[PDB]
Design an enzyme around this catalytic site. Structure first.
Site, PDB file in Angstrom:
ATOM      1  N   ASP A  71      11.901 -26.904  26.192  1.00 16.79           N
ATOM      2  CA  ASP A  71      12.723 -27.806  25.400  1.00 16.79           C
ATOM      3  C   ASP A  71      12.300 -27.715  23.931  1.00 16.79           C
ATOM      4  O   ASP A  71      11.110 -27.699  23.607  1.00 16.79           O
ATOM      5  CB  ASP A  71      12.580 -29.241  25.922  1.00 16.79           C
ATOM      6  N   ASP A  89      12.569 -29.893  21.310  1.00 20.90           N
ATOM      7  CA  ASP A  89      12.142 -31.056  20.523  1.00 20.90           C
ATOM      8  C   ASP A  89      11.316 -32.121  21.260  1.00 20.90           C
ATOM      9  O   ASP A  89      10.963 -33.131  20.669  1.00 20.90           O
ATOM     10  CB  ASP A  89      13.344 -31.701  19.809  1.00 20.90           C
ATOM     11  N   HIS A 132       7.856 -37.520  49.649  1.00 18.86           N
ATOM     12  CA  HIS A 132       8.128 -36.907  50.954  1.00 18.86           C
ATOM     13  C   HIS A 132       7.879 -35.403  50.875  1.00 18.86           C
ATOM     14  O   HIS A 132       7.204 -34.822  51.738  1.00 18.86           O
ATOM     15  CB  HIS A 132       9.586 -37.206  51.363  1.00 18.86           C
ATOM     16  N   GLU A 133       8.417 -34.772  49.842  1.00 19.52           N
ATOM     17  CA  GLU A 133       8.269 -33.333  49.715  1.00 19.52           C
ATOM     18  C   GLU A 133       6.823 -32.917  49.453  1.00 19.52           C
ATOM     19  O   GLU A 133       6.324 -31.971  50.074  1.00 19.52           O
ATOM     20  CB  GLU A 133       9.177 -32.766  48.619  1.00 19.52           C
ATOM     21  N   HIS A 138       4.740 -32.922  52.509  1.00 15.12           N
ATOM     22  CA  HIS A 138       4.830 -31.736  53.365  1.00 15.12           C
ATOM     23  C   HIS A 138       3.735 -30.715  53.016  1.00 15.12           C
ATOM     24  O   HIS A 138       3.149 -30.105  53.902  1.00 15.12           O
ATOM     25  CB  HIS A 138       6.213 -31.078  53.271  1.00 15.12           C
ATOM     26  N   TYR A 194       6.661 -27.266  62.645  1.00 12.64           N
ATOM     27  CA  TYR A 194       7.896 -27.976  62.297  1.00 12.64           C
ATOM     28  C   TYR A 194       8.959 -27.873  63.393  1.00 12.64           C
ATOM     29  O   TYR A 194      10.082 -27.429  63.156  1.00 12.64           O
ATOM     30  CB  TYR A 194       8.434 -27.452  60.969  1.00 12.64           C
ATOM     31  N   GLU A 200       7.542 -34.895  59.916  1.00 14.58           N
ATOM     32  CA  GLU A 200       8.549 -35.651  59.185  1.00 14.58           C
ATOM     33  C   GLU A 200       8.160 -37.102  58.951  1.00 14.58           C
ATOM     34  O   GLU A 200       8.306 -37.615  57.838  1.00 14.58           O
ATOM     35  CB  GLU A 200       9.891 -35.605  59.925  1.00 14.58           C
ATOM     36  N   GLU A 219      13.136 -47.963  53.465  1.00  9.97           N
ATOM     37  CA  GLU A 219      14.252 -47.036  53.632  1.00  9.97           C
ATOM     38  C   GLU A 219      13.936 -45.734  52.912  1.00  9.97           C
ATOM     39  O   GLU A 219      13.103 -45.712  52.011  1.00  9.97           O
ATOM     40  CB  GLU A 219      15.535 -47.635  53.056  1.00  9.97           C
ATOM     41  N   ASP A 244      22.908 -48.530  51.509  1.00  7.16           N
ATOM     42  CA  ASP A 244      22.637 -47.560  52.567  1.00  7.16           C
ATOM     43  C   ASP A 244      21.481 -46.628  52.196  1.00  7.16           C
ATOM     44  O   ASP A 244      20.910 -46.716  51.111  1.00  7.16           O
ATOM     45  CB  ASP A 244      23.905 -46.789  52.938  1.00  7.16           C
ATOM     46  N   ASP A 249      18.341 -29.472  64.602  1.00  9.77           N
ATOM     47  CA  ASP A 249      17.359 -30.044  63.689  1.00  9.77           C
ATOM     48  C   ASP A 249      15.931 -29.719  64.142  1.00  9.77           C
ATOM     49  O   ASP A 249      15.051 -30.581  64.150  1.00  9.77           O
ATOM     50  CB  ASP A 249      17.608 -31.556  63.587  1.00  9.77           C
ATOM     51  N   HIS A 253      13.970 -34.728  62.229  1.00  5.15           N
ATOM     52  CA  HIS A 253      14.395 -35.832  61.364  1.00  5.15           C
ATOM     53  C   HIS A 253      15.000 -37.002  62.142  1.00  5.15           C
ATOM     54  O   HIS A 253      15.413 -38.006  61.544  1.00  5.15           O
ATOM     55  CB  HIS A 253      15.440 -35.360  60.343  1.00  5.15           C
TER      56      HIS A 253
HETATM   57  C1  LIG Z   1      13.782 -37.007  51.927  1.00  5.28           C
HETATM   58  C2  LIG Z   1      15.118 -36.279  52.016  1.00  5.28           C
HETATM   59  C3  LIG Z   1      15.990 -36.671  50.817  1.00  5.28           C
HETATM   60  C4  LIG Z   1      14.969 -34.753  52.082  1.00  5.28           C
HETATM   61  C5  LIG Z   1      14.344 -34.231  53.382  1.00  5.28           C
HETATM   62  N1  LIG Z   1      14.100 -32.787  53.183  1.00  5.28           N
HETATM   63  P1  LIG Z   1      12.969 -31.937  54.057  1.00  5.28           P
HETATM   64  O1  LIG Z   1      11.775 -31.587  53.240  1.00  5.28           O
HETATM   65  O2  LIG Z   1      12.607 -32.789  55.270  1.00  5.28           O
HETATM   66  C6  LIG Z   1      13.877 -30.437  54.457  1.00  5.28           C
HETATM   67  N2  LIG Z   1      13.048 -29.548  55.211  1.00  5.28           N
HETATM   68  C7  LIG Z   1      13.351 -28.295  55.361  1.00  5.28           C
HETATM   69  O3  LIG Z   1      14.137 -27.687  54.617  1.00  5.28           O
HETATM   70  O4  LIG Z   1      12.647 -27.616  56.391  1.00  5.28           O
HETATM   71  C8  LIG Z   1      12.952 -26.241  56.639  1.00  5.28           C
HETATM   72  C9  LIG Z   1      12.031 -25.307  55.882  1.00  5.28           C
HETATM   73  C10 LIG Z   1      10.858 -24.851  56.466  1.00  5.28           C
HETATM   74  C11 LIG Z   1      10.020 -23.994  55.758  1.00  5.28           C
HETATM   75  C12 LIG Z   1      10.367 -23.562  54.489  1.00  5.28           C
HETATM   76  C13 LIG Z   1      11.555 -23.995  53.905  1.00  5.28           C
HETATM   77  C14 LIG Z   1      12.379 -24.867  54.599  1.00  5.28           C
HETATM   78  C15 LIG Z   1      15.281 -34.512  54.537  1.00  5.28           C
HETATM   79  O5  LIG Z   1      15.091 -35.528  55.205  1.00  5.28           O
HETATM   80  N3  LIG Z   1      16.284 -33.624  54.739  1.00  5.28           N
HETATM   81  C16 LIG Z   1      17.257 -33.739  55.813  1.00  5.28           C
HETATM   82  C17 LIG Z   1      18.692 -33.751  55.253  1.00  5.28           C
HETATM   83  C18 LIG Z   1      19.192 -35.019  54.556  1.00  5.28           C
HETATM   84  C19 LIG Z   1      18.519 -35.223  53.193  1.00  5.28           C
HETATM   85  C20 LIG Z   1      18.988 -36.243  55.456  1.00  5.28           C
HETATM   86  C21 LIG Z   1      20.699 -34.895  54.332  1.00  5.28           C
HETATM   87  C22 LIG Z   1      17.226 -32.497  56.674  1.00  5.28           C
HETATM   88  O6  LIG Z   1      16.848 -31.394  56.168  1.00  5.28           O
HETATM   89  O7  LIG Z   1      17.624 -32.609  57.857  1.00  5.28           O
HETATM   90 CA   LIG Z   2      24.268 -45.312  48.437  1.00 11.08          CA
HETATM   91 CA   LIG Z   3      12.786 -46.012  49.714  1.00 11.01          CA
HETATM   92 CA   LIG Z   4      15.420 -31.834  23.939  1.00 10.28          CA
HETATM   93 ZN   LIG Z   5      10.829 -33.567  55.398  1.00  6.25          ZN
END
Ligand SMILES: CC(C)C[C@H](NP(=O)(O)CNC(=O)OCc1ccccc1)C(=O)N[C@@H](CC(C)(C)C)C(=O)O
Ligand SMILES: [Ca+2]
Ligand SMILES: [Ca+2]
Ligand SMILES: [Ca+2]
Ligand SMILES: [Zn+2]
Ligand SMILES: [Ca+2]
Length: 316
Positions: free
Chosen positions: A57, A59, A142-143, A146, A157, A166, A187, A200, A226, A231
């Site tokens: 960036d 500035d 959350h991320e 992981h 996983y 998860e 939530e 929600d 899944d 999840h």
């Molecule tokens: C907190 C929420 C906002 C995001 C969260 N992402 P994650 O890190 O758990 C997704 N993992 C993932 O990609 O593994 C696969 C992989 C494994 C190894 C390398 C790379 C990738 C989630 O809950 N995602 C949900 C989807 C949703 C958002 C509810 C719509 C879903 O993926 O089912």
């Molecule tokens: Ca909303």
């Molecule tokens: Ca929250």
């Molecule tokens: Ca800027």
């Molecule tokens: Zn996750």
């Protein structure tokens, strides 16, 4: 990059102003040198090649709409780093101050975020299902959690170990949200999900069933979607964690709450000292009981409450 530490200012996805740690060398980069070996935020420029370009960036002001997801990814990674360091004495995700890398503007209309084995990645959302996902502190935490899991327990996983994986990310996502203490709740993703619908979220830890997720082992999913429901079945463990912290009576089983800080200590210890890549729900119960025993004693309320909570969700 090599440069001098600076302090920029900008607005996040929700329109809130915050200061960010940057580095100056010709440009101001999203590189925070104040934490470990750095927090680095990258622009993926709507493409899928990672990490993309270290965010530059002119500035040191980050008030453009395009800047907002970067501001929050960068800032919330800092908050999450602080949580792990200050609360658990853990230095970054590997325990040795590994550089923390995030990319924003990943792909187009991308309704998700993830840890790719090396870095965090955030979509912008399609504008209806999601706004840019780094706007949620629980999402960012959350991320990053992981990465913590992968460096520690290493929970595979899929199936039950994956649902624990998860739930660990939802649990610490939420505990980081409480740590920052801005509109905290039990939530997940409420700040970035469905801008046109108030009230929600993606998942609820307090009542997983509100979004169709199981809140008892007898309702677990055992199909193949899944990754075997990672999840979905996370709801069973999220509910147990919620009960350990806040208490309640669930399917007739009463749990005495012990609060968030003790929940965090117990699960952090379980994650780092007891869980293994193949741990199932029953093994998580045992790990949590042992962790609570280590911390509080075998005769403690804390141990009793852990047992009550797992009883309530049907995990023996
Ligand atoms: C907190 C929420 C906002 C995001 C969260 N992402 P994650 O890190 O758990 C997704 N993992 C993932 O990609 O593994 C696969 C992989 C494994 C190894 C390398 C790379 C990738 C989630 O809950 N995602 C949900 C989807 C949703 C958002 C509810 C719509 C879903 O993926 O089912
Ligand atoms: Ca909303
Ligand atoms: Ca929250
Ligand atoms: Ca800027
Ligand atoms: Zn996750
Ligand atoms: Ca919230």
């Amino acid at each position: 990059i090599t440069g001098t530490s600076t302090v920029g200012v900008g607005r996040g996805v929700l329109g809130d102003q915050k200061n960010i740690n940057t580095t100056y060398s010709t440009y101001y980069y999203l590189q925070d040198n104040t934490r470990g070996n750095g927090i680095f935020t990258y622009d993926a420029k709507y493409r899928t090649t990672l990490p993309g370009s270290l965010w530059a960036d002119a500035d040191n002001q980050f008030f453009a709409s395009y800047d907002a997801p970067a501001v929050d990814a960068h800032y919330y990674a800092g908050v999450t780093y602080d949580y792990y360091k200050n609360v658990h004495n853990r230095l970054s995700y590997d325990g040795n101050n590994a550089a923390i890398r995030s990319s924003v503007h990943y792909s187009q209309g991308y309704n998700n975020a993830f840890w790719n084995g090396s870095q965090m990645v955030y979509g912008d959302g399609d504008g209806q299902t999601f706004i840019p996902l780094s706007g949620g502190i629980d999402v960012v935490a959350h991320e990053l959690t992981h990465a913590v899991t992968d460096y520690t327990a290493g929970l595979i996983y899929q199936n039950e170990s994956g649902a624990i994986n998860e739930a660990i990310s939802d649990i610490f996502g939420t505990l980081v949200e409480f740590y920052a203490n801005k509109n905290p709740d039990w939530e997940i993703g409420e700040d970035v999900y469905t801008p046109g619908i108030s009230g929600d979220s993606l998942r609820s830890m307090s009542d997983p069933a509100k979004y169709g997720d199981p809140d008892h082992y007898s309702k677990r999913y055992t199909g193949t979607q899944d990754n075997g429901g990672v999840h979905i079945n996370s709801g069973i463990i999220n509910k147990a964690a919620y009960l350990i912290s806040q208490g309640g009576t669930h399917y007739g089983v009463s749990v005495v709450g012990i609060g968030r800080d003790k929940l965090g200590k117990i699960f952090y210890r379980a994650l780092t000292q007891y869980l293994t890549p193949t741990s199932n729900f029953s093994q998580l119960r045992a790990a949590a009981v042992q962790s609570a025993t280590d911390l509080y004693g075998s005769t403690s309320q804390e141990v009793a409450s852990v047992k009550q909570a797992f009883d309530a969700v049907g995990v023996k």
